[PDB]
């Protein structure tokens, strides 16, 4: 969670299911905004902001 410091890789597709979530496709390179929760990380996906499951992304 240093905001904007790090990139993460989408390891799976994920379709947003609630309003604070965001959609990503496997292979997308996301900006990490907030990693303080163990289960949901806040990311930027082409500049949309939202939460995706932490288990579906990794650092490069």
Curated annotation (Swiss-Prot):
Subcellular location per the Swiss-Prot or TrEMBL entry: Cytoplasm, Cytoskeleton; Cytoplasm, Cell cortex
Domain named SH3: residues: 3-58
Entry-annotated residues carrying Phosphoserine: 18, 35
Associated disorder: Developmental and epileptic encephalopathy 5: A disorder characterized by seizures associated with hypsarrhythmia, profound intellectual disability with lack of visual attention and speech development, as well as spastic quadriplegia.
Subunit structure: Like erythrocyte spectrin, the spectrin-like proteins are capable of forming dimers which can further associate to tetramers. Interacts (via C-terminal spectrin repeats) with TRPC4. Interacts with CALM and EMD. Interacts with isoform 1 of ACP1. Identified in a complex with ACTN4, CASK, IQGAP1, MAGI2, NPHS1 and SPTBN1. Interacts with SHANK3 (via ANK repeats). Interacts with CLN3; this interaction regulates the fodrin localization at the plasma membrane.
Function: Fodrin, which seems to be involved in secretion, interacts with calmodulin in a calcium-dependent manner and is thus candidate for the calcium-dependent movement of the cytoskeleton at the membrane.
Family note: Belongs to the spectrin family.
Protein name: Spectrin alpha chain, non-erythrocytic 1
UniProt lineage: Eukaryota, Metazoa, Chordata, Craniata, Vertebrata
Full protein stretch here: 965 to 1022 of 2472
